[PDB]
Design a protein around this nucleic acid. Structure first.
Ligand SMILES: C[S@@+](CC[C@H](N)C(=O)[O-])C[C@H]1O[C@@H](n2cnc3c(N)ncnc32)[C@H](O)[C@@H]1O
Lengths: 328, 94, 107, 98, 87, 98, 82, 106, 94
DNA sequence: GCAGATTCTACCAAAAGTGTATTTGGAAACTGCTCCATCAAAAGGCATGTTCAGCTGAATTCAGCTGAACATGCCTTTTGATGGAGCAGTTTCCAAATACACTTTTGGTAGAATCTGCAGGTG
DNA sequence: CACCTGCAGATTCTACCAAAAGTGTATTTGGAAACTGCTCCATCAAAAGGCATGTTCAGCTGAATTCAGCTGAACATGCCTTTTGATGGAGCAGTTTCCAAATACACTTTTGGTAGAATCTGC
């Protein structure tokens, strides 16, 4: 028939059809069922005790019966917790921040339900701006922790893909607004469905999120020059978009107000920035650069570690150039 | 007999990147070896390439392919842009 | 008049490079754009190595680039290290690198 | 009387030499070895002084890099002491004797 | 030209401390007593090979003086390209 | 139920494969692998049949010789079982990692 | 049942290669390590071969493109032309 | 007219070797003796390998030289093995060789 | 379009050395690769020798030195004698 | 028994050899001048040789457990047959590359003069 | 390791210029471009020959333990390399002369490669 996993708070349950839909050769409906159940067990002590009953750890992905005895144990366990939650125990608070293992899982659940065919997004020829966005969880966590977000800030993702980075930042840190703009029609279209689904799923799990918009647009345009300058936290994914594009994005980080931070996967100027007598076209005349630690557990398809590079707008660099020229 | 070297051109470039930095004669000798080395490597790859394709002419297209064959990833990308740009500009000036 | 280097916007000598290509017996003919493209690449690679070597010199509180700085620049840079994987820079020394198991104590 | 433990000074020496670039073999003795060897190949040869220095820079770079590989071979065998068999394995894998 | 001392056993000029120093630059912390002779033997082969080719270039040019360039070319032929000496 | 001891058959296979010259990876799977890798460099490519075979002859000769060096590294550490660290040591000394 | 292409280089095929290489006993982890090594080898050789293919304005990788690629990588192969 | 090969007492084609040298862009000019000397060297090396290869075919009870025989001839010959130290002979296989420590303790 | 190879000459040599021995297609292709390979190595070495010495001409002398640089000991000695013999014989003939 | 090597006839653009005239690289000849071999003298940076014992390599023992051998069963690979994607052979044609005579600019470099980064020693 | 003095090596100018490099007509031609025939490559069907998987235990790896003696650290002694200089002259390298040998066609001849047909043979 179907398989149903009911909400711990009594939002609206998640329904998974039988036969099980497959999204790709690495993600199927069955694996989403198993992951929900682990993470709910981790949030609610009592739930996991009730998952101890009957047969446990002999379920398998496919076989109606094997997954239904697990689902059915969970649905009974949810009911019990809801009766209990009317009592001395109270609902799972929606001001409690998510933990990193749980947050990763909420985006994974959400992702599969917005994007019903991710392999297609993965066909790109390297060296163009059509190159589909999205970043590993670890990298984005490195950004969130090191480069603080405050509620006097504005977060923007140029080349956001499906907008999962923005979402992750908005549940884990607060800001005035959190945004995603993506150029290529297919991943951006999905970015809207992600924003809505993400909000439904954050309530469902009883956890806190901020306020965010994933927008469909073009991040390689004139309008977005002004958006970037009045923004103070820019995450931008680029490296595999070509030198041509790297130039045009650089020009737009130039428009940025003093104080602004740019977190990128592209070293726009050398780490150890030295003066040029033609840095009237080079972005490094207006920024301090340092390269953030490579993280292992985020390797590419050539098997290379992904870095991010922290660039900080500082006009002292510029002030010094000019003074050296005024002399003699 | 006059003996040529890329020294003055290496110096001009040094001054563009690091205005107040000098270079010892031994380092300049190393830079001159480097330039000659890469010139020969690229020229030889270009020569073979042209021969393999039964072409008697080495054009910027053979230099570009030689550069791609010889240089590691990111260096090849940037070298390619700089050479392409230099030729497009060169051809626009006459 | 104007040099072919100025017309191409280069610091490296297009005329010289064209000549060297002809004298090297690489092919019966050498097109006009070949030396331009090649001089540009050589210039770019030299800009890259000098950028990094001057930084190594600065790191070592020196104003003059010496062979050791060229070596630190090349060996600390993945791509230049590969391009010069079979090249020995005289008076370059090596990168400081002591295998872990050789250090004393524990933890 | 004070004594550093065995290995302490060795580590100090490693840091010192990996920081510098001067040649480590005495110059005249190396020049005589070059002349002796060359002489057995061909009599009455003369040498530009830079030709002997070039041979020395190349010979030392070659040996330092071979000791790095040798060291890796000793460590591979759970040792910290390099031995003739480590140099031999290193040269064999390099194709110098293969 | 009168006389010219006989050159012999100069491989021993590559002393134990010099070899120890070279191994230290190579990151080596402990050295077996047999390493010194083994290293001399390896250095002799290396030198014979490069010098043989260098002198071959010297003879071909009909010179009696081995030049830095004869060595640079010999090193290059052997896949040991050396920068700094005109090469 | 007859049973050869561990190693007896291994030795038998070494003797057998060192006597022959046929390729040891199956052709189609190798071809698929080759096409997939090439598609990342240029889409919609075709391959002459001899092109794939040359790649396989070269790839197999490369792996077989690498296994020989790997084996010397395992033996150097007093083992008879090759491990990933043996392949890594061999590749590093060959300069494929270095 | 699906199958990742590099997984098509099977444990038995790898063991045979190892046997010709004189190997008597193999660690279970060797197979994946070998696959990784073989992929890098093919990526390096194929990249150059395709570079020659494209330079020739062809859509077909020829044996000669492969021979030239192997040769510049110091892996000269006899038997396929050149 | 007598072929340059016959005049040199060679089987290899002097004329072709001269032509290949000229068009290979090795030098602006190519002297008359160069292609003769080079052809003779190529002939000699060829004879050396075929000589040892043929012997290997014989030891194997075969009258036709196949790649395996060229590999056995080259790898068993110290000098040819070094000359071809970075060459792969397709369908050559390897020399029978098992590390002693791997043999059973009889 | 003609496809030249050393096949027919390799075969003539085979008959001189082993009159009743044949050679398969694959083996012959290997021999053709061998001859082309040695030709290129020797020619390239001779080319470099002449350039190093600023000579426009590759003569039997550059071929000889190239042989001594490229071939191992005994092989070089016999190749040199074979080459010298052929140029002598050749030079002495109306 | 048969896939692949060998034998034979026929076709011909491609080569290669011969003949003629012009062009030229580089040898011998003479010599300017760098720099190589060599002798001298002084002295301190290091090599040598020894003592002493810390701790490393080498041996021995042993048990957990990983890999080898193998029997059991099917799915991916191999083999043989067939439309076209393009690799090539052919023809056409000009943008662009030699060839060649001047005219102008510039990188070397020989010699003398003053500058300046940092080696080297100190605390 | 920041500060400070003596100095070799480096960046600072003057004048000379042959070798470059560039500007200007004439002549030549390599190879892009278009059309197209002939391979031989991609793909499908089915005859065909391993590979995946779980079981069992032999024997290998590596941990724990021990200790003989190698090899590092420190030291005394003084040899020989290094440094500073000078000098004869071997020989490298510049300059001019000038032919033996190479390039440059033009023409005649032979030859290796290709295509098709059919018989032969090592394995
Ligand atoms: C590497 S993808 C981003 C993936 C996602 N941001 C992440 O970090 O995983 C880069 C994105 O930049 C977008 N892009 C490029 N130029 C743009 C432009 N001018 N305006 C908006 N988006 C642009 C592309 O469409 C592409 O999806």
């Amino acid at each position: 028939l179907e398989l149903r996993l009911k909400s711990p708070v009594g939002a609206e349950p998640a329904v998974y059809p039988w036969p099980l839909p497959v999204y790709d050769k690495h993600h199927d409906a069955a694996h989403e069922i198993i992951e929900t159940i682990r993470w709910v067990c981790e949030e609610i002590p009592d739930l996991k005790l009730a998952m101890e009953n009957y047969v446990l750890i002999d379920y398998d992905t496919k076989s109606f019966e094997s997954m239904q005895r697990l689902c059915d144990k969970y649905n009974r366990a949810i009911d019990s917790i809801h009766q209990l939650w009317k009592g001395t125990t109270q609902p799972m608070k929606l001001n409690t921040r998510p933990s990193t293992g749980l947050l990763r899982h909420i985006l994974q659940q959400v992702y599969n339900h917005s994007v019903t065919d991710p392999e297609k997004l993965n066909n790109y020829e390297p060296f163009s701006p059509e190159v589909y966005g999205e970043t590993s969880f670890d990298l984005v966590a490195q950004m969130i922790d090191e480069i603080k977000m405050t509620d006097d800030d504005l977060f923007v993702d140029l080349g956001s893909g499906v907008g999962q980075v923005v979402l992750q930042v908005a549940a884990a840190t607060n800001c005035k607004h959190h945004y995603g703009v993506e150029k290529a029609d297919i991943p951006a279209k999905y970015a809207e469905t992600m924003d809505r689904e993400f909000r439904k799923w954050m309530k469902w799990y009883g956890k806190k999120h901020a306020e965010y918009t994933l927008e469909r647009g073009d991040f390689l345009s004139e309008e977005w020059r002004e958006r970037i300058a009045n923004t103070s936290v820019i995450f931008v994914n680029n490296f595999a978009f070509g030198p041509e594009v790297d130039h045009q994005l650089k020009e737009r980080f130039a428009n940025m107000k003093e104080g602004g931070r740019i977190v990128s996967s592209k070293p726009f100027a050398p780490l150890n920035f030295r003066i040029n007598s033609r840095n009237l076209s080079d972005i490094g005349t207006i920024m301090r650069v340092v390269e953030l630690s490579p993280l292992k557990g985020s390797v590419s398809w050539t098997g290379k570690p992904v870095s991010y590079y922290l660039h900080t707008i500082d006009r002292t660099i510029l002030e010094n150039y000019f003074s050296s020229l005024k002399n003699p | 007999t006059r003996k040529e070297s890329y020294a003055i051109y290496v110096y001009k470039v040094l001054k563009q990147v690091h205005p107040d930095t000098g270079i010892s004669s031994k380092a300049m000798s190393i830079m001159n070896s480097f330039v000659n080395d890469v010139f020969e490597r690229i020229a030889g790859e270009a020569s073979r390439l042209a021969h393999y394709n039964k072409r008697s002419t080495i054009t910027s297209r053979e230099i570009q392919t030689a550069v791609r064959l010889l240089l590691p990833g990111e260096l090849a990308k940037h070298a390619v842009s700089e050479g392409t740009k230099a030729v497009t500009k060169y051809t626009s000036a006459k | 008049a104007k040099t072919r280097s100025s017309r191409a916007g280069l610091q490296f000598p297009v005329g010289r490079v064209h000549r060297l290509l002809r004298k090297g017996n690489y092919a019966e003919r050498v097109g006009a754009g070949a030396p331009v493209y090649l001089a540009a690449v050589l210039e770019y690679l030299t800009a890259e190595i000098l950028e990094l070597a001057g930084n190594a010199a600065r790191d070592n509180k020196k104003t003059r680039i010496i062979p050791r700085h060229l070596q630190l620049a090349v060996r600390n840079d993945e791509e230049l290290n590969k391009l010069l994987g079979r090249v020995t820079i005289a008076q370059g020394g090596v990168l400081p690198n002591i295998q872990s198991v050789l250090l004393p104590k524990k933890t | 009387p004070h004594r550093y433990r065995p290995g302490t000074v060795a580590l100090r020496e490693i840091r010192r030499y990996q920081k510098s670039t001067e040649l480590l073999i005495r110059k005249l003795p190396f020049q005589r070895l070059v002349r002796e060897i060359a002489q057995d190949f061909k009599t009455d040869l003369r040498f530009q002084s830079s030709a002997v220095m070039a041979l020395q820079e190349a010979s030392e770079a070659y040996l330092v890099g071979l000791f790095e590989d040798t060291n890796l071979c000793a460590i591979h065998a759970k040792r910290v002491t390099i031995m003739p068999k480590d140099i031999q394995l290193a040269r064999r894998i390099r194709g110098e004797r293969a | 030209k009168r006389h010219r001392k006989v050159l012999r056993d100069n491989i021993q000029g590559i002393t134990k401390p010099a070899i120890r120093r070279l191994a230290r630059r190579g990151g080596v912390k402990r050295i077996s007593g047999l390493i010194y002779e083994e290293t001399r033997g390896v250095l002799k082969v290396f030198l014979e090979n490069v010098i043989r080719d260098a002198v071959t270039y010297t003879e071909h040019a009909k010179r009696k003086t081995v030049t830095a360039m004869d060595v640079v070319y010999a090193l290059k032929r052997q896949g040991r390209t050396l920068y700094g000496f005109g090469g």
